[PDB]
Amino acid sequence: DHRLTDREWAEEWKHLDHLLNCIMDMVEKTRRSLTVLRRCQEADREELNYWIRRYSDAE
Amino acid sequence: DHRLTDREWAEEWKHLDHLLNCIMDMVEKTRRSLTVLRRCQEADREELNYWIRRYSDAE
Amino acid sequence: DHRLTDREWAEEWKHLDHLLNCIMDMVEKTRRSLTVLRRCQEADREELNYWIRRYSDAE
Amino acid sequence: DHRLTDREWAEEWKHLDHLLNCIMDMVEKTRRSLTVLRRCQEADREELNYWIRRYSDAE
């Protein structure tokens, strides 16, 4: 039966609300993951430039 | 320490992969919710037009 | 030499950040379109209950 | 009379569907930007290990 009772209809709206909230949650968890990754990136790059400099100073 | 071991770095990429997959999952669960809602909408509208017609036939 | 400058890396992560921002915006835009559609759906639902009752009072 | 026609309702749900489609597209676009950035990050990581080893061979 395609028709929803009032209770089914309110629960469906709730669930949609919840799904959209979870999407936003997961988008921020993704932003947090990239913050981590970028911090790693920056620190690797500082270590890389330091070692290039080391090698070239011992040229 | 901002730098990730190789294992931490592979796990971070994994987790990002997983987060993005979950977002896509939840977007499709949302599409499914709206399919439900629209089917309810259409069936309510058919019932509404039927009852308007009923009332007007008993005018 | 195929590896990025500091500025190129900074652009990359900013571009990622922008994409996530576009996703959030698109979701909160969905959330707001849905507030209005629930309202429209409810008007139809309750209008159905209305005609049904007027029909019953009239017998 | 403030309730929507059949066509207006059909537009509404199609507009929702489009927004979800835009979200999916934005996510799979993130997924593809990330494949390239992992590659760039890895080039830097391994280039670091490289200079470290050449430095050690040279003492």
Side-chain angles (χ1 to χ4, degrees), chain A:
Chain A
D1 184 358
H2 287 357
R3 291 239 303 132
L4 301 193
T5 63
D6 284 356
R7 272 293 79 84
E8 296 173 323
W9 186 74
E11 288 309 309
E12 189 67 45
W13 290 103
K14 235 219 85 312
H15 167 67
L16 242 187
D17 188 58
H18 168 80
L19 287 169
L20 293 167
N21 293 160
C22 275
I23 290 170
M24 278 176 327
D25 192 35
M26 318 276 185
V27 170
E28 299 300 330
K29 285 191 184 167
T30 297
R31 187 173 324 261
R32 174 42 186 187
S33 174
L34 295 177
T35 290
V36 171
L37 284 169
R38 173 164 68 70
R39 297 314 175 35
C40 170
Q41 183 268 299
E42 284 169 1
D44 280 343
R45 178 54 101 203
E46 284 209 356
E47 204 181 339
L48 171 63
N49 293 333
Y50 178 64
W51 293 102
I52 291 170
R53 177 69 179 277
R54 280 275 234 147
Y55 190 85
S56 150
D57 280 341
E59 199 115 274

Side-chain angles (χ1 to χ4, degrees), chain B residues 4 15 33 45 48 58:
Chain B
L4 301 193
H15 167 67
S33 174
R45 178 54 101 203
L48 171 63

Side-chain angles (χ1 to χ4, degrees), chain D residues 5-58:
Chain D
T5 64
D6 286 344
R7 190 170 68 189
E8 291 173 345
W9 265 123
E11 288 159 333
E12 281 310 337
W13 293 111
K14 150 64 211 164
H15 170 210
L16 283 175
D17 190 76
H18 176 86
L19 259 2
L20 296 180
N21 296 336
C22 267
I23 296 157
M24 297 297 307
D25 289 351
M26 300 299 112
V27 167
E28 198 93 24
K29 183 171 273 303
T30 300
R31 258 157 103 73
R32 331 264 184 90
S33 284
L34 290 169
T35 281
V36 175
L37 184 139
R38 170 164 178 167
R39 182 188 102 237
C40 289
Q41 211 160 326
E42 174 70 351
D44 263 20
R45 289 179 65 86
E46 296 310 337
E47 190 175 332
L48 165 59
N49 291 330
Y50 170 84
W51 278 120
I52 284 172
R53 303 207 17 110
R54 273 189 73 188
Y55 188 90
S56 325
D57 175 63

